[PDB]
Amino acid sequence: PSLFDPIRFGAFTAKNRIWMAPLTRGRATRDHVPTEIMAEYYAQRASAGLIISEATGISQEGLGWPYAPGIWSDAQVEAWLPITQAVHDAGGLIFAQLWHMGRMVPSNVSGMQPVAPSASQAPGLGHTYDGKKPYDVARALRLDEIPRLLDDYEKAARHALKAGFDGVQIHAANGYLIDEFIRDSTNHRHDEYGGAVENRIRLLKDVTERVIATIGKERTAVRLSPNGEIQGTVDSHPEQVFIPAAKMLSDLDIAFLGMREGAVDGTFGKTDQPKLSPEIRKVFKPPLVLNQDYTFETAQAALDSGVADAISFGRPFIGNPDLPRRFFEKAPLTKDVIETWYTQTPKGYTDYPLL
Template sequence: MTPVKTDAAPSLFDPITIGGLVLPNRVLMAPLTRGRGTMEHVPTELMGEYYAQRAGAGLILSEATGISKEGLGWPFAPGLWTEDQVEGWKPVVERVHAAGGRIFAQLWHMGRLVHPDMGGGAPVSSVAVAADGQAHTYSGKQDYATPRALPASEIPRVIGDYVTAARNAMRAGFDGVQIHAANGYLIDQFLRDTPNDRDDDYGGSADNRVRLLREVTAAVAGEVGADRTAVRLSPNGVVQSTNDSDPVTTFTTAAKALDALGIAFLEMREPREASTFAKTDVAPVSPHIRKAFSPPLFLNSDYGLADGQGQLDKGLADGIAYGRPYIANPDLVERFKAGAALNEPNPRTFYSQGPEGYTDYPAMEAAPA
């Protein structure tokens, strides 16, 4: 059943302005790595069909997309650093626009989670400490390698890679870009105090640890416009060996810095006690961020329709980003509006090649009775 909104709160189905765009609803498609590109990280025709099927979202956030060979360590994930990749994205974006949708490219540098076997050389991070666990490679899972601590002198080069990828995204026709600063990847490896124990301008205080995020965001916004720039954060709990001893201080510092830059919106993966995919015992940080960040705020992590609307009713969010529900439900907004049942996703095909479990989930009108 569709939840009844309060008079003071917007509905998930109400429009919202984010930066330079007016979205028809507040349901975002969260970034979802699906591994349907080529080994050269070029988008494929099948990806165009997949994203066009989901164009009813207020905004699609693309799967994480590598900014450089150094920074991309996921097999068959797309990139945005070569001309072939830009040309591969163009028809994908065109199909989304033809279907009435809007799409941002998510810019990704995985830092120490890139294995050298992926061809990008030694991985880089805030410090020379390997993550726990194993990396996905074309030859199977392998233990994470010890990264090279990124010297301050090389940081402008990495920032330049973000800027180039952002420029390429706009050349490919994207409506904007989202900087991936969450989930234990490179910027998060600088942002949080585990693993970042540097003693230079990029370590120590929260303001120093936020520096890389602030510099990347300022540079990208300078290239494509702050109104076409967004950021993703993951403010609570350990993820991929990355954690923080004082997430409220760290992430409110980050939120204030992003607010000052005037970005379009902030989207946050924040696991909750109610989460099924990822749980945390850390209290939500988003209420603190809400006070520090004035542009639209979107929350993400295992929300359904009712509890997602509940965050809007309580004034804690301006919209909700849905991930796994969009894998199996290309028409998620329509299903929500109709109070219809959702298809269940098949984890076996999350990262497989081909259309199975990718473009073959039925829309509501085509689903069996």
């Protein structure tokens, strides 16, 4: 397959195999309501086969990123309409990334204590509405709270359809809530959601089954990050836990699995925990979309091997609205301005020229 060849996935055909990775940009409101400028931003990049949205909070409890959007309220759904409309006018497809940040939710943002599989304090400093602050002490989510959490995911997934998204991708990477349950450095639970591999993927499983029951498998995607430590989340033997995860996901027949894979020389994830896509390819039958550090040449190499069906691009899409065109034209890629990744205005957001 050619990077430029269409791909069938779920209920859809993407126009190409050059996809937009989920990118948190912070151009929504303090109260996590999307804004008009986000529509232009996404429209510019509609040549992406699929745009995966920036991470979108499923509830205030799960949303701790300042000026990131949520999707739990009616006013949020309404504000998303112009964004999805724009994408579909430009002929493109967009999935919503559904986001529970777990232990990484700053109380300055959510207003409450963050929840996690297990009690702990995330290392580091979180972005807030008054500067960086260190993270709070999370509480271990009670077994009797999992029914609620699932309803939070259900509401969010239906709200995504109302907002005009083609479907959802469940954020289960990068050290946020689901990924904390999966990995043995963060999951120290004694009940049916911790200890054994099947217990550790149990939240992933039930949240996936609840989304599938709400909006159909053909609109339901998952993100994982099985290799390399991130935000104090790592597993001691990731092959033991992520391969069974990938097989459980494949049996549900989700629309695609996206994964960000760290590398020894990785620039958004550095690690010698090796990449598990080769082993995950063998158990995961639906489309497998690989990410992190791909060039045009390495992305097509991955397609040529069959290990990837598509590749998402992150920072390249930030400064290169029309990446696919720049690829085939052999046009230099504009470099993204790191300082403006997460500021609040149009500068370094919608002001990168197209070709």
